[PDB]
Design a protein around this ligand. Structure first.
Ligand SMILES: CC(=O)N1C[C@@H]2C[C@@H]3O[C@]2(Cc2[nH]cnc23)C1
Length: 130
């Protein structure tokens, strides 16, 4: 229905605003673009599904996310990729792990405060019906 397409357009507006607020935070700069194959030629042999905040905005605009749950699966993949690729005790690895955990926790906290649980349940019920 037209009302259902208005629901999904409100979901996209909401996801673009959360994603912009993560992308401007100086802590999260390392997550704003794909890892450069040139600088790190080993990255794509270890990490089988790379993800970054620029790809997330592209995916919103391609209508890839019909629920906030499917968006959070990509935020979780950015964070789990960084924990798996940078697991060592040295300060460089520990700093990127601390930033990855802060990106995940910040996204979840904005969604807990600003997403209406009945808006998310409506998106889930339209998705299930298709
Ligand atoms: C997001 C992530 O997990 N990354 C690991 C890489 C290792 C290190 O920070 C890089 C990018 C880079 N270029 C040169 N050294 C590096 C980003």
């Amino acid at each position: 229905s037209m009302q259902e397409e208005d629901t999904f357009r409100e979901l996209r507006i909401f996801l673009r605003n959360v994603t912009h607020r993560l992308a401007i935070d100086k802590r999260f700069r390392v997550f704003t673009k794909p890892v450069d194959p040139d600088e790190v030629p080993d990255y794509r042999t270890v990490i089988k599904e790379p993800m970054d905040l620029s790809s997330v905005i592209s995916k919103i605009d391609l209508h890839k996310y019909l629920t906030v749950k499917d968006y959070l699966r990509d935020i979780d993949l950015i964070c789990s990729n960084a924990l798996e690729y940078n697991p060592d005790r040295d300060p460089g690895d520990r700093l990127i792990r601390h930033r990855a955990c802060a990106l995940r926790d910040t996204a979840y906290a904005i969604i807990k405060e600003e997403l209406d649980e009945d808006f998310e349940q409506l998106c889930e019920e339209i998705q299930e019906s298709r």
